[PDB]
């Protein structure tokens, strides 16, 4: 090699080995002798571990073969590149946009934050015990503080992933490349004072170009980003630094068009993947975002997380976990923070209740009956795991239910053997609600194929019937207890002063003070649950009717229409409903019940008799959609009004906007089902009349502004 | 075009090299020699190639499929399709479908209870092939692949 150091280094490459012997000739001779299929390895060693291996001289698998431009190859961190103000502001700008790409865009740490040569230089000094001195204040002080503040944010992210709240290298990548800063990294106050000192330098600085104004906001943004650890260490609920982060990011977004930024070449590169220890294949650097809109998303997502602290009942925390991450997937930082903010270190929920007391509130508000048991201890753990599953990504969210359904079922059956009716009832509600949620979530993930829509929509309709039946019986008992208390009041007006009246007034006043308020609240909550579950039940029945109409014309079937030679329709069906196979109540209907129910829905007639039954099915879809729209409108009304109007209790005080937004999209999807039903009819009737008929297929289409638990079964021409 | 389907010959070096080069270009996830070595040396009966008899080099395989089988849990044998690729100039001729048929038929004769594979949700060509054979989607994996795309886990139940 031409470089002197490489020449001098090659002399002492193998100096730690006193005597080396060429065994290349011996290896070749023995390997030629061996059979082509044989592999020499430790018999205990598993060959599956070899699949995780990198390969030399493999462009996809070799980090060393990465190609670098001249500017990237050297780039001494000590050189102050001209112009200093424009370059420092451009370096600091790209670093922030590297963090957004890492967290918001789920990109890898080495190709984002560690891609900067400055951050590598700083962390290497921290591993030992600023890291570079350039002679220029902007790079030495203003830029040195920016790198320190970002490296501090990464360490805080490591503390979050250490909790195992979210899955690593899926929701968030933390490939530290072997870095361990230990306790050497300074404290939050020191990092903040460094950034604050740099801001004061800029105010005194003479150059008044737009780059200075943007560099001030970049220092301010890092300051407000460092304050993110305040919500975990101190459980801060103050939106002061989250609002400053939003105001700072708004000011920079209007600054990007007025000026063009280009950092010194070689500042951000794949250099670190080439000359630092790396057990992973090389990776290109994905295009960074053009604006700071990620910090606004992150700041808004964290503000939402802190709102759960303001909850005053179990139902308010329950609906928060049900709506804060339902419409779209929240920022990974916010998703990790919620269980850590909810389930605190002191083994308390939000610092207010213990794990068992928090569980008892859910049973109390659901049953309206006043309550170190091992079943209570286990159910409490199960409830917290249910809360933590709500903050998982849209795919893991469904997979979490696959594990809960059998533990809820086992727990319920354990409550049943001891004849604990209240806890068995509540567990049944969580188990059955999860089965419906688990099933319907598959449509949002396009899990089921169009031929499977009937099986799943009718099964949910089957489940929704059982849940409505259960909730209605619960509400009748609740109303029964209310009427009993109302009966004591009537019995007191017709009574005269006496010993027997004093016993009744004492009984009545006890029930009004300790029971009536909860009875009314639980009843009104069950009223909302009944409207919520009938919207589910109706929508499912609309989907089944739509499917049945499609099969009536011969356009779809509840089995795979393509001929296969290895499986049958029953085996495929049992595999689809495998998760619900071991659950006893409600039992999974047999394969025969699925087949017979569909044949009842399918219009077997032809001609004018067909027209009457077809109009009957379409008339139901159009009328039920309007019924669904009215139920959603009534729910949306109660949400706007609150939980003190006397009819509906929704517990949506903390997620009011999200809940109305959810039901709005649910209303959009409902109207789409009615419109689609009419298009399908006018098309198929005309297609049958025409002797040349298009070949149609059905696809599960998602409404752009609707709820994709109920996709639109849409006709489409095959063509070529 | 005269497509011939035959099992992999473990002693042949060119078949091994052609399979790897074929799979490396067409598949996005990178594989080392020992990925192929784990499949081919332990399940040599579960890899099939498609060659063109009328081609300029009839020995070179234009399509291949790489599979394996292991007990899943304790009571079931789970066949697994690791790689499947067909040359760009040979696609649209039913070659991949035949390779998947002969391999699943092989795994079924070996008393597999199910077949499993992972494919990209954006890979419509592969989804149509398997779902057309009875495969259904049992799982969606968030950003499963190196290219950050989601994956579907497809399972075909045989018993």
């Amino acid at each position: 090699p031409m470089e002197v150091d490489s020449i001098l280094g090659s002399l002492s490459i193998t100096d730690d080995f006193d005597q080396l012997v060429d065994v290349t000739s011996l290896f070749d001779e023995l390997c030629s002798k061996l059979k082509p299929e044989a592999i020499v390895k430790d018999p205990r060693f598993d060959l599956f571990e070899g699949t995780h291996s990198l390969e030399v001289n493999n462009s996809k698998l070799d980090s060393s073969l990465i190609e670098l431009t001249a500017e990237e190859i050297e780039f001494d961190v000590n050189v102050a590149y001209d112009p200093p103000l424009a370059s420092v502001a451009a370096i600091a700008d790209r670093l922030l946009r590297c963090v957004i790409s890492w967290l918001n865009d789920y990109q890898t740490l080495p190709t984002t934050v560690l891609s900067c040569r400055y951050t590598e230089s700083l962390l290497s000094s921290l591993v030992k015990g600023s890291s570079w001195c350039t002679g220029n204040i902007l790079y030495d002080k203003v830029l040195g503080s920016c790198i320190l503040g970002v490296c501090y944010l990464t360490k805080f992210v490591q503390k979050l992933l250490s909790a195992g709240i979210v899955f690593e290298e899926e929701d968030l990548n933390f490939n530290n490349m072997g870095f361990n800063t230990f306790d050497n990294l300074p404290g939050q106050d020191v990092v903040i004072n460094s950034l604050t000192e740099s801001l004061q330098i800029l105010e005194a600085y003479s150059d008044d170009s737009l780059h200075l104004t943007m560099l001030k906001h970049i220092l301010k943004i890092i300051i407000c980003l460092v304050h993110l650890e305040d919500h975990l260490t101190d459980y801060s609920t103050k939106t002061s630094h989250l609002d400053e982060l939003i105001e700072n990011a708004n000011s920079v977004n209007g600054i990007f068009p007025q000026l063009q930024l280009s950092p010194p070449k070689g500042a951000f590169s794949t250099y670190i993947q080439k000359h630092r220890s790396n057990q992973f294949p090389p990776r290109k650097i994905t295009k960074l975002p053009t604006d700071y809109s990620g910090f606004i998303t992150l700041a808004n997502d964290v503000k939402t997380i802190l709102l759960v602290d303001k909850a005053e009942s179990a139902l308010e925390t329950y609906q928060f976990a049900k709506f804060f991450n339902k419409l779209e997937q929240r920022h990974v930082i916010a998703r990790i923070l919620f269980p850590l903010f909810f389930i605190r270190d002191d083994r308390t929920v939000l610092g207010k209740f213990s794990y068992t007391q928090f569980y008892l509130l859910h049973v109390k508000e659901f049953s309206a009956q006043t309550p170190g048991n091992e079943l209570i201890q286990e159910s409490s753990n199960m409830l917290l795991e249910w809360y933590q599953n709500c903050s998982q990504n849209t795919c893991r969210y469904r997979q979490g239910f696959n594990r809960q359904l059998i533990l809820w079922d086992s727990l319920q059956a354990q409550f049943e053997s001891v004849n604990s009716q209240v806890y068995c009832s509540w567990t049944y509600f969580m188990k059955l609600s999860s089965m419906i949620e688990f099933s319907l979530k598959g449509f949002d993930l396009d899990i089921y194929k169009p031929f499977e829509a009937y099986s799943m929509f009718w099964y949910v309709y089957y489940l929704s019937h059982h849940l409505e039946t259960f909730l209605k019986d619960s509400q009748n008992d609740i109303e029964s207890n209310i009427n009993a208390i109302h009966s004591m009041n009537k019995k007191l007006k017709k009574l005269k002063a006496g010993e027997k009246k004093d016993q009744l007034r004492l009984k009545y006043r006890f029930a009004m003070d300790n029971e009536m308020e909860q009875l009314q609240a639980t009843k009104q909550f069950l009223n909302y649950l009944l409207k919520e579950i009938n919207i589910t039940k109706s929508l499912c029945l609309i989907e089944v009717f739509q499917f049945a109409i499609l099969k009536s014309f011969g356009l779809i079937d509840n089995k795979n229409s393509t001929p296969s030679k290895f499986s049958n329709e029953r085996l495929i069906h049992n595999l689809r409903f495998k998760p619900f196979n071991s659950i006893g109540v409600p039992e999974l209907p047999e394969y025969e019940v699925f087949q017979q129910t569909l044949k009842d829905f399918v219009i077997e007639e032809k001609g004018a008799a067909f027209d009457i039954k077809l109009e009957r099915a379409t008339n139901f879809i159009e009328t039920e959609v309007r019924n669904v729209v009215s139920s959603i409108d009534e729910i949306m009304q109660g949400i706007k009004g609150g939980d003190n109007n006397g009819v509906l209790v929704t517990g949506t005080r903390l997620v009011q906007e999200l809940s109305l937004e959810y039901y709005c999209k649910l209303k959009h999807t409902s109207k789409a089902l009615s419109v689609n039903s009419k298009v399908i009819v006018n098309t198929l009737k005309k297609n049958i009349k025409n002797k040349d008929s298009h070949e149609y297929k059905v696809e599960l289409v998602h409404t752009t502004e609707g709820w994709n638990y109920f996709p639109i079964q849409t006709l489409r021409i095959k063509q070529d | 075009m005269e497509i011939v389907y035959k099992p992999l010959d473990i002693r042949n070096e060119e078949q091994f090299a052609s399979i790897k080069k074929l799979i490396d270009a067409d598949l996005s996830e990178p594989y080392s020699i020992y990925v192929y070595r784990y499949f081919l040396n332990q399940w040599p009966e579960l890899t099939y190639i498609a060659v063109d008899n009328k081609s300029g080099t009839p020995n070179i395989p234009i399509g291949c499929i790489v599979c394996k089988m292991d007990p899943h849990r304790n009571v079931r044998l789970r066949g697994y399709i690791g790689m499947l690729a067909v040359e760009s100039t040979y696609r649209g001729h039913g070659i991949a479908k035949k390779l998947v048929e002969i391999a699943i038929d092989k795994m079924q004769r070996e008393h597999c209870d199910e077949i499993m594979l992972e494919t990209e949700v954006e890979n419509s060509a592969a989804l149509n092939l398997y779902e057309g054979m009875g495969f259904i989607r049992m799982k969606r994996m968030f950003r499963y692949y190196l290219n950050e795309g989601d994956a579907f886990k497809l399972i075909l139940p045989l018993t």
Partner: peptide
């Protein structure tokens, strides 16, 4: 398609 994992 089998996925690579470290």
């Amino acid at each position: 398609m089998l996925r690579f994992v470290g």
